C-alpha cells in the first residue's frame, strides 16, 4: 500500500468538494477527486491540476453516487492504485430552488431525486469505503468520514422543503454510522450555512449576524480539521453558517 | 359543514393510529379511519367499531399514502362528508428489521420503500388536507397536524437505518411545514420508543431508566393533548420514550 | 394519607402558578398554594379561594425557596395535612430586565440573585419533596415534577443574561434529576416563550409565527398534561413558544 | 500595539488551559497565561516555560476570575504590554465529586461556588476583555472567544449536579454572548468528555465507543482550530466526548 494517506472526495468538481480536495492536497495527502459526469469533467481536471501543483498525488474517478456499482468501481479503482483510504469527504449533492410553501410545485419524483443522491449515494459511497477505512486505520489513530450535510437539515430551511428533508435523513444516518463503525471509523456531519462559490451577495450577508458569507475554502478547512486533528469527535453535525441559528 | 370536529388518521388500523383514532372518538370527534389495504381491513373495522361504541361518527378511506392520487381521493372523501378537517394524524409507516451493522443487508430499494410510506406519504397526506385544514382554522383557534415520528429518528437507533434515515427526514420536515403553514396550522411531530401493540417485554422494560414500555393509548394522549390543548406549540418533536434519551 | 392526590406549587400566587393551582384544583386534586412573602399574600388568597370554588382542599404555605429551610418547612406543612405529594410545580422564579448587551449594568450580585431562586431554589424544593414524591409512586405509576424554565434557556434570549444562564442551568438540571429520580419519579421542564399575565401584546404577537402570546392557563395545562397522561416522558424540556423557535 | 496576535487564556496553569496556551505559543501567537493564585504558579511558570521554548512572547497574570476586579485588572496588565487581545479561552473552572444521587452531600453553598467561577467568573472575564476583543478585529477577520464547558452540560452527568448546572449556564451563556458581539467576536464554548490530565483510565477508555480517553491537547486544537480557521462558526457547543453521546 501506499505511504501517503488517501483522501476520497465525492462532489469533487466544485465547490466545497473542489476546495476540499485542494486543502488535502496542501496537507499532502493523496486525493481521489469523485467527478460527476461528462458535464463536470472540465471542472475536475482544473481540480486535479490545482491539487497536482499542491503537491499532491491525484486520480479522478467517475461515479453517480446513487448508483452502487459507480460507488463500488470508484473504491476499486482508488484501492488499485493506492491500496488504503484514510478519509471520505461525501459532497456529492443536488437540489433545486422550490418555495416551500409551493405546495402545488414540487412532487414524489423531486423528493427521490434529491435523497437518491443526498443519502442513498452517500451511504452507498460511505459502505463501499467502509472495509478500506477499517483496514487503514491503526492501533492509535482512527479514520474519518466527513458529510456535508446542510443548516436546512437542522431548521427545514433551504432550497426545497425535500432538500431539507434528505438532509435530516443525512444528520441522523451520521449518528447510526457513528455508533456502528466506532472504533475504528469516526463518523461526523458538517452544517453549512450561505457559501459562495464565485445583490444576492449582500442579502445573505446581511442577514447573518456575522455579516459575511462562507466560501468553500472554510468548510475544505473544517473537513480537513475534523479528519487530522479531532481523534475524539464522532456523530456530531457542526454547524457553520456566520451565526444565522441565533436569529 | 358538519359542527363536530373531524380528525383524520392514517395508520389507522393498528397500533398508535388505532389507538389514536379511538381516543379521538372518546373525546367526542368524528373519525375519518385510515385503512391500508385489504390486507389490514379487517382490524379497521374493529377500529371503526370501537369508535363508533365511543359514539363517534365514522368513515373508513383506504390509501396508500405513497401515492399521491390516494391522499387526493381520501381528503375528498372526508370534504365529502363532513366538509372541515380539524386535524390530521399521520401514523401510516414501514420498516424492516436490519441491523444497522449488516451493510451488505440493505439496499437501495429498502431507502425507498420507507421513505415512500415515512416521509413522502406523510407529507403528501399533509399537502392533500392543508386546504380544508386552513379553512377549518377559526380567528382564535388553529388546526393541527401531528407526525409520528421515532425516536430512531433523534438518534439513529431502531429496527434500520433505512427507518431511521427517514424519521431524520420526518422531523426535519415538521420544521418546514410548521414554519410556512403557520399560523392557521400547527404541526408537531412525537418521538415514541419502545411501544407494545400487544423476554422481549422484559429486555425493553429493564434498558429503560422508567422501566416499562409505552402502550399505544399514551402516543393517542399525547396527539390529542398536542390537538386539543396546545395552541402555543408549534415545530417540535416531543419524545416519549421511558428516558431512553437518559442513557 | 389522603386518598385524594396532591399537587405542591411554587410561586402559586400569581402567573404560571396560579393558573397551575387552578388547573390541578379543576382535577379534583389538593393543592399546596406556595405563596412567596405578605407582598404576594393577598394574591395567594385569591388564587387559594378559586381553587377551592373549584372543588380543591387547599393550604397556603410561605416560603422563600432559596432558603432550604422554608423549602423543608413547606414539605413538612404537606406531609402533615396530606402525607402524599403527587406532583410538584416548581414555578417560583425572578428576574429583572437588562437588555444583554448592556455588559456595564449587570453585575455578579444580579447572577446570584437570579440563580438563588430560579436554580438552587428549585432544587432545593424538588429535594425536600422527593421523600414523599417517591413514596407516592404505585407500582404502575410514576409521581411528576415540573421545572418552569423558559425559551430564554434554550436559546439566551430573555430578561436578561443572567435569567437565561439560570435557565439553561434549569434545563441541564432536569436532565440529571429524571436520571436520577427514575423510575419513581419522572421529571420535566417546561419552555415558555412571551406570556401575557393580564402595543407590547401587539409587537409580541406579531414576531411569533403563530400570531399569538400565550396565556398563563396555557401552560398549567402542559404541566397538568405531563403529570396526569404522560407516564413515559421524563427529561424532556417541552417548548411552548407559538413558534419563536422557528424565526 | 503589538504587531503579533495574543491569547489570553484563563485557567492556565494545568489541564486544559495549559495545553491552549502551548497550542497558541506553538503558532506563533504572545501569550497572556492566566495563573490562579500562590498554589498553582509553580505549574504556571513551568507552562511559560514551554510556551517561550516554543517561541511565544509570555506573561504571567494572577486571577481569581470570580472576582471582577481581578479580571479587570487581567486585561489592563495585557493591555499595558501589547494593546490588543485577538482571542480568550476561558479554562478556568472548579468542582467537587459528588453523586447527582446523594441529594444530601450537596448544598447551596456548592452550588455557589461552582457557578462563581464556572459562569460568573467566565461572564466576568469576558466582559473585562470585550473592549480590547472588539478593537483587534479587523475589516475582515472577527476575533474569538472560547468558552470550555463539559459533557456534563449537555445531559446533566459528571462530577456533580451543581457542576453539571454551571455547564449548562455555560452553554447558554455562549448563545447570548454570540448574539450580542456578533459581528466583531465569535463565541463558542466546547464540551469534553473524558480528559485524563496525566483502572480508572481502563474505566474511561471501555465506555466510551472510541475506546479511548482525550488528552488536553485535543481540546487545545480545537480551540486554536475555532479562533483561527473557522470564521462562520459562532453560537456553537462542540462536543469531543469519544462517541459517549452515542451511548
Ligand atoms: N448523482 C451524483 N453523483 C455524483 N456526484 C453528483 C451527483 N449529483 C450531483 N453531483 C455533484 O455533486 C456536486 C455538488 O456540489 P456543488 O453543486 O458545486 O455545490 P456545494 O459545493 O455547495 O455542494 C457537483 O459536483 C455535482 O456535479
Ligand atoms: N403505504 C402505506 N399507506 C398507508 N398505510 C400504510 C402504508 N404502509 C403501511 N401502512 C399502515 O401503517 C400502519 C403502521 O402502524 P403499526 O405498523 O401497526 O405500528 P405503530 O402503531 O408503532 O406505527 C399499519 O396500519 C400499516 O398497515
Ligand atoms: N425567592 C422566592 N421564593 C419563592 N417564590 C418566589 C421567590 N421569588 C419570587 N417568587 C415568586 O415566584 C412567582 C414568579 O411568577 P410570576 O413573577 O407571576 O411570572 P410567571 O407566571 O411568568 O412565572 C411570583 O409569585 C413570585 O412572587
Ligand atoms: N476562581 C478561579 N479563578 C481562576 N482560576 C481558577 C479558579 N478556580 C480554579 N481555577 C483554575 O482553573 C483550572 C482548572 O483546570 P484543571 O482543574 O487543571 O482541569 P481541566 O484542564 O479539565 O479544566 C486550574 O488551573 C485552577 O487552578
Given at each position: 500500500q501506499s505511504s501517503t494517506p488517501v483522501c476520497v472526495i465525492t462532489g469533487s468538481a466544485s465547490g466545497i468538494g473542489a476546495a476540499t480536495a485542494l486543502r488535502f492536497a496542501?496537507?499532502?495527502w493523496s486525493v481521489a477527486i469523485g467527478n460527476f459526469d461528462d458535464s463536470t469533467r472540465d471542472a475536475a481536471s482544473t481540480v486535479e491540476?490545482?491539487?497536482?501543483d499542491a503537491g499532491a498525488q491525484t486520480l479522478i474517478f467517475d461515479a453517480d453516487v446513487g448508483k452502487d456499482a459507480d460507488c463500488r468501481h470508484a473504491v476499486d479503482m482508488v484501492a488499485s492504485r493506492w491500496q488504503r483510504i484514510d478519509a471520505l469527504i461525501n459532497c456529492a449533492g443536488t437540489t433545486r430552488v422550490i418555495p416551500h410553501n409551493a405546495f402545488d410545485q414540487?412532487?414524489?419524483?423531486?423528493?427521490?431525486?434529491?435523497?437518491?443522491?443526498?443519502?442513498?449515494?452517500?451511504?452507498?459511497?460511505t459502505?463501499?469505503?467502509?472495509?478500506?477505512?477499517?483496514?487503514?486505520?491503526?492501533?492509535?489513530?482512527?479514520?474519518?468520514?466527513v458529510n456535508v450535510s446542510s443548516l436546512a437539515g437542522l431548521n427545514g430551511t433551504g432550497s426545497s422543503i425535500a432538500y431539507a428533508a434528505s438532509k435530516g435523513a443525512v444528520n441522523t444516518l451520521t449518528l447510526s454510522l457513528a455508533r456502528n463503525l466506532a472504533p475504528h471509523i469516526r463518523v461526523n456531519a458538517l452544517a453549512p450555512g450561505m457559501?459562495?462559490?464565485?445583490?444576492?451577495?449582500?442579502?445573505?450577508?446581511?442577514?447573518?449576524?456575522?455579516?459575511?458569507?462562507?466560501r468553500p475554502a472554510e468548510i475544505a478547512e473544517?473537513?480537513?480539521?475534523?479528519?487530522?486533528?479531532?481523534?475524539?469527535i464522532t456523530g456530531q453535525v457542526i454547524a457553520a453558517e456566520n451565526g444565522l441559528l441565533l436569529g
Amino acid at each position: 500500500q501506499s505511504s501517503t494517506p488517501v483522501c476520497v472526495i465525492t462532489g469533487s468538481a466544485s465547490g466545497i468538494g473542489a476546495a476540499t480536495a485542494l486543502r488535502f492536497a496542501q496537507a499532502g495527502w493523496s486525493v481521489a477527486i469523485g467527478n460527476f459526469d461528462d458535464s463536470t469533467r472540465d471542472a475536475a481536471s482544473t481540480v486535479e491540476a490545482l491539487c497536482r501543483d499542491a503537491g499532491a498525488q491525484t486520480l479522478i474517478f467517475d461515479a453517480d453516487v446513487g448508483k452502487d456499482a459507480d460507488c463500488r468501481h470508484a473504491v476499486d479503482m482508488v484501492a488499485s492504485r493506492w491500496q488504503r483510504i484514510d478519509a471520505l469527504i461525501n459532497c456529492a449533492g443536488t437540489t433545486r430552488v422550490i418555495p416551500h410553501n409551493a405546495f402545488d410545485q414540487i412532487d414524489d419524483f423531486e423528493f427521490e431525486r434529491v435523497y437518491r443522491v443526498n443519502l442513498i449515494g452517500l451511504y452507498q459511497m460511505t459502505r463501499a469505503a467502509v472495509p478500506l477505512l477499517r483496514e487503514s486505520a491503526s492501533a492509535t489513530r482512527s479514520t474519518s468520514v466527513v458529510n456535508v450535510s446542510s443548516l436546512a437539515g437542522l431548521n427545514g430551511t433551504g432550497s426545497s422543503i425535500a432538500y431539507a428533508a434528505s438532509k435530516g435523513a443525512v444528520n441522523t444516518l451520521t449518528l447510526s454510522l457513528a455508533r456502528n463503525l466506532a472504533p475504528h471509523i469516526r463518523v461526523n456531519a458538517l452544517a453549512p450555512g450561505m457559501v459562495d462559490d464565485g445583490g444576492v451577495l449582500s442579502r445573505m450577508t446581511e442577514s447573518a449576524p456575522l455579516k459575511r458569507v462562507s466560501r468553500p475554502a472554510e468548510i475544505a478547512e473544517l473537513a480537513w480539521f475534523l479528519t487530522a486533528h479531532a481523534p475524539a469527535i464522532t456523530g456530531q453535525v457542526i454547524a457553520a453558517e456566520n451565526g444565522l441559528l441565533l436569529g
